[model samples]
Target chain A: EVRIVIDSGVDSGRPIGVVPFQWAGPGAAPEDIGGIVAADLRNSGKFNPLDRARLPQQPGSAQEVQPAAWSALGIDAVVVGQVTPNPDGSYNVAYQLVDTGGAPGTVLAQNSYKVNKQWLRYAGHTASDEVFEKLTGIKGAFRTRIAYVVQTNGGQFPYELRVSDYDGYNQFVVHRSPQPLMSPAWSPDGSKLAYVTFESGRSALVIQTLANGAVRQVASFPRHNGAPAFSPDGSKLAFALSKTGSLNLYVMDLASGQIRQVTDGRSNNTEPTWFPDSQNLAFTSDQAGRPQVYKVNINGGAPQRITWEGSQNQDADVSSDGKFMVMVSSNGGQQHIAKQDLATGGVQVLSSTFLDETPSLAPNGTMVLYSSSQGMGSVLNLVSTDGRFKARLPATDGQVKFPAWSPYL
Target chain B: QNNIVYFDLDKYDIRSDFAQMLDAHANFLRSNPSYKVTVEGHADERGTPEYNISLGERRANAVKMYLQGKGVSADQISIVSYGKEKPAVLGHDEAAYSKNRRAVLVYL
Candidate 1:
């Protein structure tokens, strides 16, 4: 049953005005459907889930929502909906976001969808997008799933290739690896994952189908071939290899098995990151001297230096929107995750005290997750790009390193 | 008379077990008045490129200074430092660090 029960907003999330609605009328009100849609939207981290406990003391529907009450409660907007049980035996859900302000702000975004119980999540995600776009100017990642590697602090020490809600909740471990797994990359449609692991004592890249956990060894160089990152179209995989004894960037054409080497110069050049537009890649290198960040074209061109403020910039992840990036830099004498604005090159340091490495951005490009040390022990922590919220994702092993946040699944 | 010496990371000041062999070099200068000697040093790869290089130079100087004070002429001794680029032991880790830190004396 569709239900909306707003408890409390997250410690690092924006605040919202929400209420729980249930079907309790003479025939039944689709109150549950409205609440369910609201919760779905709020969980996306873009919009604040409305607080049923703190909502204004007024009763209303999507049409009769009193902007005055919501304004008094400090709510910028409210998502209200009506769920009608169709005579044809299906559910028709009408969801709308009611704005509080007058002229400068929008009033409501209304839409109707017909679906069954099997597609409840599908309907909920669509409703979430409507309410999300109405409140926030950007499209919501609610309808998307994200893939990640979950290596718990346990025995056998296998990396579980897991898929989870884009919000980092409701995760399910999809595959287990007795060896270590590195760099979990997503297919654009969110169906397959390309990752690196060692088999028979040699590093290799493998692609795993998420729908049924089917796997295929994509590429395993003779030695030191690791960090496989998928191109936007998922036809190729860019990775690092030292087969000839120099760490260089290489892309493997999945169909023809043609491997193209991208970087060739003096120094250790590893960790190639693909741009969102899928045109070029940003990577780590000690080419000029110290380990610094450099950008190279996807079609093979001169390497352009991107970071100058730091001496050691390695293991960076690009934002989905192509507007920002996060990297692990040894700027403050210790390694920490740092975010950079691609337009202005503005830098923001996110971690303190412990040594952090391999920063990856969320599918929504709102937060970054990385590995950091705490009291001599290492753990996984996700931090908002704006530095508002920080959460320690529990790890399952001796040391947790190389966290790669997947694109929208 | 001999003076105390110091070394870093993997080297010992003096090979205590092999002093009987090293004392012959220390005793050779005792026999000749104009005899000259040179002490060279090496280090393990446990540290950075520059630190170990500088440390190796200091190791040789440590031994040369100690030997010259023990009656060898000041002009008799020269020092050369070969850092981790030269490994006395080819293997890796702690065992290699100790053997690599060394000082060898040559008489002329």
Candidate 2:
């Protein structure tokens, strides 16, 4: 009564065909709507969009599709649609996703929506969010934002902190300084950014609200104060401050402005990332002579060393699930992005670049964005969690580094 | 350690040779009772910016600790960590790194 169409042996990705949307409008659709959806699905590292030219037939509607034809072309699913012009200069787009699996001609999903001309791109991403969720059972991060630092060699105001769409679009500089801008972390609600600004010949941590461009200096200790990471509930912030006669980890209760030392004055500790539970934190420390990740319970006691494979590991970020962490791993002087299993201390290198750093996961935890020196200068790169597909984002004028992916809003 | 001191990779323990150099500076500070010196700490561009800043502080403190041991008053010295922002040497090799990892006593 049924047959399996896909080979199921292909782990790289599932084959899906996203046919070009038939346009009944005045001219070409505002943009390649179907291409955008295809890109969104492909970027997740889950589905591979089939070549449009190889499709045996281009189906405009679900009624026109023949599932056996897609099975012959080795596609597990097919997405087809049409864009019809509305009298009010809007367009109505209808789409259907047909599965070629065991139930050979099953209609997995279908939708019809109207969008204004200017919002076509966003609609494409929205469509992608639906298709992605339907197939993977995980929410998509297609519409999330990201924060990073961009440096200009032109040297007027050398360093800038940028916030933009996940795809590197609609970027706007939030802060600029002659000194360095490092360690940007987002608030839980994604409305504010807590970052480091080197001003007045000293490093200080500042929390900035994205809505009005208003900023407040949060930590300005005598020596150095940076790497301010907010807790899950946004009630407390942890950073590296020099009160122990050395740089050490300290937590500040935002409500009372009370600060407490977390790691005793033993060694250098920096880069604090909160566990999803908000009770524990993972940070980078050089206690064993070389930098390695260490975790500490905010309540007190000896900090536990968490990483052992690398010569040095700094800038550790906890995954959304709090089960693993991704960090900038250094071994024999070559830096790469690597993931570590928190429970077993197992390690796996995720990148092949010679100088890769600052890896952060999307809210969905399906993809990672980090900085790598792949081009002539350091640029941001995205890769699947398993080290499979990768793409370099649009390069900035100068070097770009220190990427922090935002959580789902 | 007579005129200047060198540190091992990522270590803050003052090297034996650095004692002579810091001793001379300590003697100068002891003689000049009204003088103040700011020990500016620095590090090479071999680590993350924040970690490098912390390392530079450790280097600066190691020098301050040596000066205090040589009988210089704590108030007579101040410390600042520029991290890797200001480099003494322009090269990226070990030779340049050796020169950049330093602490200089600036009289104010």
Candidate 3:
């Protein structure tokens, strides 16, 4: 079981309350909708969800809410919901986000969802997303998923590609192999994943559709084929290939299967991450003798170096708005995740760990999820863009690395 | 025979200490043209995954180019890189990293 431990949070976050959802079902609540919403809000590091034990009232709807009591308790907002069971084993989840500071009966946001038993957790996340957006003004990423590679038995056992909710629940293995798997990249629509697999006795790129478990070998060049990234428009794939005796960046048109070399020369260029516009890519190159992030146009041009504060920098993931880039930077021999403002060239080190790499951005670009080396093994960690909030997702069984946050579903 | 050639941290140039061992493998490959070998390259866990892959490939090709220069047939050798994924030693210190950053010749 993977569990999320929040290390720190923004002190200025608005205090909110998520009341225990009232159940009108036959026996009991199938899932804890209110608890799930509170967990999501707490994990985001943006809002302070009031503890259930501290609540003065257990309001199941906006009508039952006492705004004066919550205001006296210093909670700015409160969420109340109910779960009604349908005859066909489904559920109707209705929730309201109310402002405790405003006049009584001021409903900030309200929505209702219909879902089956299996989708109750998703309904909870959907409700969290709505409440979060209503309060923070930034779109919530609670409904999105994350993909990562899990390795066990000291490289002797099979490596598993697993997918789970952003909060580290409902995990299911997508593929497993004795050989190693690395660099899992989610498609734009979150319907597929492109990753490097060593099952072919060498590094190769393969795309797996999540719906049907169909795998397609997209690149198997002679030497190295790795670091696959899908274009934002889903029309192309950018990756690294060493077939020409030197590692270089390449882009493949998905429709025509045609490949184009984006970077040339003997400099080792790899780890291509697409910009939001899909016309440019940020990748790691050793042209300056040490690894650093470089940006290049997909069509072709001289690559522009993007980082200079560290001795080495690599494994970059761009934000959705194309204003920032997060990457692994080696400073004074300690590697940490750093966020760079693309316009001002200012970089803020976000992680304080000894070994941190593979910085993947959340869909909303508010948080960065990456891998950090722990005692004898590695685990996934999250840091807010401003370096104010931090959290960790510790794996119970094996080392988890290469975390890729999916787009909002 | 020791078929692994270790490399310095982040450096792939073939060191002179491994020249004699590489020469032995090159002579054997040149004499026995029917035999093929795969050079598996690896790196320490200090670097990023994809960049370590490129570094490992460069290490493997450094050995590959050296053997080819010694008159071994190009078709007699292939290469692959496992980067830092497969560590010979699980420890995180230099004692383990020195062993992990290497190119191994697997005779097939």
Among the numbered candidates, top lDDT falls to 3
* TM of each candidate vs. truth: 0.69, 0.85, 0.97
Model 3 residue runs over 4 Å out of place are: A10-12, A154-157
Model 1 misplaced regions, further than 4 Å: A1-15, A24-50, A57-60, A83-93, A103-107, A114-122, A152-154, A168-170, A375-378, A392-402, B1-108
Q: Tell me the chain A TM-score of model 1.
A: 0.83
Q: Mind giving the per-residue lDDT tens digits that candidate 2 earns over B5-108?
A: 56666776788777777888999999997888787788876776677887788888888888999999998987778776566755657897788888777775
A1-409 per-residue lDDT for model 2 (tens digits): 1011122212357788898888886778777878878777777778878866777888887777788888886787888878788889898877788787666667788788889887676677777887888888999788778898887775778888988878766688899898878878888889989888866666788889999999877888777888788898878899998756767888889788788888875778888989998889999888888889899999988888888886888888898888788888888877888888888888888888656777888987777888766534567888767777676675637777778888876
Which docking category, incorrect, acceptable, medium or high, applies to candidate 2? acceptable
- Two-chain complex of model 3, DockQ on C-alpha atoms against the true structure: 0.85
User: What's the lDDT for all of these models?
Assistant: 0.63, 0.79, 0.90
Looking at model 3, the pairs that clash are: none
DockQ metric, candidate 1: 0.03
Candidate 3 lDDT (Cα, 0 to 1): 0.90
> After aligning candidate 2 to the native by TM-score, how far in Å is the CA of A6 from where it should be?
26
lDDT of 1: 0.63
lDDT of 1 by residue, A101-187 (tens): 563135567787888755555666777776766666666556665555554555684566666554444567766777655667776
Interface RMSD of each: 12.8, 2.7, 0.9
Backbone collision tally, model 2: 7
